[PDB]
Design a protein around this ligand. Structure first.
Ligand code: NA
Ligand code: NA
Ligand code: NA
Lengths: 88, 88, 89
């Protein structure tokens, strides 16, 4: 039946948007880990060079965090619309 | 109107494919980063001996999981678009 | 009515696709910045040790992400056109 397939299709898409939000969240965790280690090593290299840049991803991290949230928000919005389609 | 609903889901499924592919590329990038950063940390260790290990294993695994699930969603949605298109 | 909520649903998805393209673009910037700093440190390391490593090469990945940013945005334009078609039928 056409409309049940339509509802199921939107639901599969919402699942994909949810997995995308989760993937961006994981990417943020990985970037923040890289920043920490890279700056630990730059510090050490400096200290060692003197005995003888730095990486700032803060803007990109905040934008990705904002995208995680906004994607998760769209999944709630899309679910409500899917609910309305089921209502009709 | 069915044709345009079908075409619109097909357009969305293409975006889901592109996203899965893009996450795959980010996974490859993050793995190359880890390998280099840890090579340099090791070189710095040695040279001081004459630093934290960067561990992205859990994040890479999670991203590979999301890539595969996104691809699975494209198969499921393709099936459903075929069903809407077959509406008789 | 069903059709209105179908149009609204596709528009909500198109928003998510746009946010996804923006997010990929941001990741591309972050990865380019990481590449730059990591290779500056490897260069400094090589110079120090030789006075007294492998280049991180993300070129292919960066290009692939830039291609995906572009294609996802092109998809949002196409999908908006199709939404305009439903809206008018
Ligand atoms: Na920044
Ligand atoms: Na990990
Ligand atoms: Na490369």
């Amino acid at each position: 039946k056409a409309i049940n397939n339509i509802v199921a299709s939107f639901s599969s898409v919402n699942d994909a948007i949810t997995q995308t939000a989760e993937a961006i969240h994981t990417v943020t965790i990985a970037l923040n880990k890289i920043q920490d280690v890279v700056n630990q090593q730059g510090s050490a290299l400096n200290h060692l060079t003197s005995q003888l840049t730095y990486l700032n991803l803060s803007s990109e991290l905040k934008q990705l965090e904002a995208k995680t949230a906004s994607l998760f928000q769209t999944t709630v919005e899309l679910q409500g619309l899917i609910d309305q389609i089921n209502s009709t």
